[PDB]
Amino acid sequence: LPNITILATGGTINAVPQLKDIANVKGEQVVNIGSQDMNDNVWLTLAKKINTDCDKTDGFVITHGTDTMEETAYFLDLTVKCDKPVVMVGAMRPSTSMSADGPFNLYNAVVTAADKASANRGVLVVMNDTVLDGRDVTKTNTTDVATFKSVNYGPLGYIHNGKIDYQRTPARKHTSDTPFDVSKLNELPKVGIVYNYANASDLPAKALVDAGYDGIVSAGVGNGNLYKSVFDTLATAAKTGTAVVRSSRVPTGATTQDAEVDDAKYGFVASGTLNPQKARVLLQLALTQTKDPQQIQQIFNQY
Amino acid sequence: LPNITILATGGTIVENLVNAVPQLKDIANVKGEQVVNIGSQDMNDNVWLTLAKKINTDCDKTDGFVITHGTDTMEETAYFLDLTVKCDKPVVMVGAMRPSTSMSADGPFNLYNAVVTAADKASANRGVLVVMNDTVLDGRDVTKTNTTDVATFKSVNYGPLGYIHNGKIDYQRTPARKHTSDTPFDVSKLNELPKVGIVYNYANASDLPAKALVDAGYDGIVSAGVGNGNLYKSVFDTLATAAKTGTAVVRSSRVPTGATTQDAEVDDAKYGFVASGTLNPQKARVLLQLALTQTKDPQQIQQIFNQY
Amino acid sequence: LPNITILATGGTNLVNAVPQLKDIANVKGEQVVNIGSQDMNDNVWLTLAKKINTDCDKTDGFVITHGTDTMEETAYFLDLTVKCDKPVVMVGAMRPSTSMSADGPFNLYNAVVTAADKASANRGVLVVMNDTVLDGRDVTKTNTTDVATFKSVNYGPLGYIHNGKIDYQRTPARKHTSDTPFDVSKLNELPKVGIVYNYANASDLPAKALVDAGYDGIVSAGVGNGNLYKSVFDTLATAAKTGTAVVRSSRVPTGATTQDAEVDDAKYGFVASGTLNPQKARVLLQLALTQTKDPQQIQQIFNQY
Amino acid sequence: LPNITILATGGTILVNAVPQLKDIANVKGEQVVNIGSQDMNDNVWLTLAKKINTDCDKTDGFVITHGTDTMEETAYFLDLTVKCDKPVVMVGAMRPSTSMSADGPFNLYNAVVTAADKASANRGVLVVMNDTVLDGRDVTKTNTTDVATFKSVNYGPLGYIHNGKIDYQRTPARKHTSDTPFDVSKLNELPKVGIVYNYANASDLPAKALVDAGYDGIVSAGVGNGNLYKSVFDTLATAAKTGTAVVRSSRVPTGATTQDAEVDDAKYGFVASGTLNPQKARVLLQLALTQTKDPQQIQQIFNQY
Ligand SMILES: N[C@@H](CCC(=O)O)C(=O)O
Ligand SMILES: N[C@@H](CCC(=O)O)C(=O)O
Ligand SMILES: N[C@@H](CCC(=O)O)C(=O)O
Ligand SMILES: N[C@@H](CCC(=O)O)C(=O)O
Structure with missing residues (x-):
């Protein structure tokens, strides 16, 4: 089973014992904020953590609030140099609500991070059984569980019964093919x-x-x-x-x-x-x- | 044939206008006037107040209105008019996503369909409308969804009121939210709006x-x-x-x-x-x-x- | 609390599975048939229409639980043949009730919310899926697997559900329910x-x-x-x-x-x-x-x- | 300027009608058949694939003009059977050529833009409609009347056309054209x-x-x-x-x-x-x-x- 690291940042999201069937999961809390308060310091922390820990794991899942997930994903897409799977996930309904989407969303995020075909595609967002590239992915609806879409170029793949059929990859340069290196930065331009x-x-x-x-x-x-x-x-x-x-x-x-x-x-x-x-x-x-x-x-x- | 007034504000799309689309003569007696001539990116309160007062003052001179407008802020003007217009005759906004000199320019047919809509008595009492890409959209929900596509205008939450096929509308919907003569907003004596x-x-x-x-x-x-x-x-x-x-x-x-x-x-x-x-x-x-x-x-x- | 009848047909004691139902209605359920909706047929349609039409004055509204594959067909048939103008709401689920993040529980809750809303009356037969109230005429299954599959693809939804409240902005203009001439009260078969x-x-x-x-x-x-x-x-x-x-x-x-x-x-x-x-x-x-x-x-x- | 061949099959859609073509390509046409695409058939498919395969070295790219109703079927057939790796672009019109705001002229222009772009080679057979480049496999007609009808409804378009330039961001992963085993060079009929x-x-x-x-x-x-x-x-x-x-x-x-x-x-x-x-x-x-x-x-x- 692959080793997958969950980096928690916050948002509404062992509770998912089916994870044991697909990965060896270990988690670290990076920060604990609503994504409406996402900021440059968290981005810098996350990129440095993934880049530093890349050789310790077989892939990453970042749990994050849905509100600014599309911004964090693109930032990581440009600044991460690890070409192992890096997958963002959140939840549109509270974990205590009826038909909470977080458990399945998390399972599918780990499925994606564990799929070696996910490597080299840039930073991904996995939501509503769909694998979305970090560049084009955006929140299209304020409440719907199906809100995340790649509205210009479409998704990379769909998840059915724990398998991904990948039919697309982003053409724009990402991750280890960009010049952006934030390893020594403690602030970003305003x-x-x-x-x-x-x-x-x-x-x-x-x-x-x-x-x-x-x-x-x-x-x-x-x-x-x-x-x-x-x-x-x-x-x-x-x-x-x-x-x-x-x-x-x-x-x-x-x-x-x-x-x-x-x-x-x-x-x-x-x-x-x-x-x-x-x-x-x-x-x-x-x-x-x-x-x-x-x-x-x-x-x-x-x- | 109904009397239809075109009020021109600017945008890609009034004897110049009328003469480009001679088929309008088949469906209406068209007249109209240039109110302002600006790109809609520069649309402002003074234009809104001018338009609402003009439609409200001229309501009995015509059977319906078409406002030609730039696409970039059409959705804002439409909602302003939807709240301030007291004329319940058809008031229809229209623009064009391609320049009138371009191949397959959308302006001519868009204008035709806008006059179809303003000329249809079933259009009355549905609030101010936007007619684009063969579709009748309510002024409240209608928005520009795409930067370049001719099909850009959609009512993204509740859908369109009607579709136009061969100069006929099948209306299946009407906005539940209060509009036009059912609102308390009266801008007849305002020269400025709250900031x-x-x-x-x-x-x-x-x-x-x-x-x-x-x-x-x-x-x-x-x-x-x-x-x-x-x-x-x-x-x-x-x-x-x-x-x-x-x-x-x-x-x-x-x-x-x-x-x-x-x-x-x-x-x-x-x-x-x-x-x-x-x-x-x-x-x-x-x-x-x-x-x-x-x-x-x-x-x-x-x-x-x-x-x- | 309104009295709501759940008529089960098939697809994926409900007060026990979804205890929150007790907060919004007095629910009773009856099993009408038990079939996969891929096997839906004229006889089930006629049974449902007659049952709703006969039972209309015994309840304040109906929820029909149904397979998603042909829900759009049953919904339109009922929209043309039901003479009860009390809320009639169909609901299903795209994920098995035992699966991770099963959609059925909240779908059923929202269906009962809708059937319990007096504003739902006179809008014809409805489909409630993914927090959305959809008219039975336009509503269709747009995707093979997505929980968000049901859409009114030509004229859009009637209303959206948030926190157990509906903001209705639309109603279907086409004649439905008690405004149609179709009366199947005496029919045991339909034209082929x-x-x-x-x-x-x-x-x-x-x-x-x-x-x-x-x-x-x-x-x-x-x-x-x-x-x-x-x-x-x-x-x-x-x-x-x-x-x-x-x-x-x-x-x-x-x-x-x-x-x-x-x-x-x-x-x-x-x-x-x-x-x-x-x-x-x-x-x-x-x-x-x-x-x-x-x-x-x-x-x-x-x-x- | 590239040499582009237009193969006409029928539907609503000459360097005379669209003189701007002369700015981007040297265009020559041949009428293969002249039918409404509702009458599209295996014999036309076989004729088209063998013509493109035979004529590949005489030109720099192909545009096929076709009715919209079965364009999506022809496109996928050609996507599987064409062995020419040069651009092969299908195009139609949703409005009659004599109607107000007819879409054929700009659609044809953009199809020739696409067929002339070297980056179009090796993407498989393409459909170009409403300023969008679509792969032949996923492309489908989503609306009965809209000029924007053609969409790649599962995986999205390959590129968008702005002022005669394509920004390609996607390519089909499934094998196509010269990478398939299908060879219809010697068939006069297809399985039923x-x-x-x-x-x-x-x-x-x-x-x-x-x-x-x-x-x-x-x-x-x-x-x-x-x-x-x-x-x-x-x-x-x-x-x-x-x-x-x-x-x-x-x-x-x-x-x-x-x-x-x-x-x-x-x-x-x-x-x-x-x-x-x-x-x-x-x-x-x-x-x-x-x-x-x-x-x-x-x-x-x-x-x-
Ligand atoms: N505002 C919250 C919404 C809850 C969530 O999406 O997790 C956030 O983005 O963190
Ligand atoms: N910016 C221009 C674009 C052209 C047009 O839409 O008419 C405007 O909105 O007026
Ligand atoms: N084929 C089944 C799918 C499961 C379900 O939706 O309940 C049906 O439509 O009944
Ligand atoms: N039935 C015609 C429609 C017109 C057209 O698309 O050209 C065809 O597909 O050929």
């Missing part, structure tokens, strides 16, 4: 997100610029478009060296280059299919390597 | 955006929460102060479908917060701005978020 | 209606077999917008002019089979199914054929119910 | 494979008619996870004991028909289709039956292709 909508205030953008943030992600309208006062603030900030990534509040589809915004004129980067919170993760890691907008665009084209 | 901003939640979220809106004395803040309207700790701290110091706080969600419910992780009664239900952040802003024309009381604003 | 599939190189032999057997009706699971393979079109065009009702439906999982597209139904004596998928179109055609054999009247029925 | 539908009260007459005609194979559009109405099960179990190949697929539009569920396939000699829907399972079963009649070897083929 990156904030501003929302666009009718009559949008420029005060949020201005507050982040006044505080000297390293980067700002715009949750734009449509294809990453900006309310004019937000555009003005971010254009000024980019000329003073703030990195600016245009993403979109729209829940599927890319924010493209060569659409309505002249990104080369303003020094802006287009996020592609990365939603605002995922775009933040990649921007904060890009800013550990470069402040140059063309190099940041290349990073957003490859990772 | 409502939106803040995003994510890992390590800054409190600076929320603090900036409190410092400026905003009437309201809508939170684009994580999951079921949950707040990053530092944003919670700021919004807790806001709600006790004269700024209404609505918890919505960045998550694209499903309700932000009462009786979940946040004790809204203790903080003086309101839960948005299925209204996404930008839609929640629309109703909060209109609620604040009537009341500053959080229990009354919650009642408004449970009825409209 | 079969389904044939269309695909590249499709055999005409299935269609021919049902005509040779004297079926009252045939539903076509057409390609695209209810289109028919040439040899199937030949068989059904003859059948429609020689005493067999023919409904064009679609194997395509969403959208209508429309009037006024490629197939001129008026001229062939065919009926277009609209959004009804083949198995749902069969339900309405069997019930239409209890009233009329006229293609124009059957089309009107497919336009109203 | 029919499809029967399951529903409540299903007739066994369709299944019996196909067995009486000596069909090589029968695909079942099962309920739920490939389940069978009792009388259909009985007919197909009898047929499989006399050598008829039997594939269990599902009428349910997404998800696998799995091994190890309610049906003991090994005991009956049945094959589970996995994610292949009934019409797709027919394609693979017809081609499997050119190699083997053995149920275990047919199952292995359904596990690999």
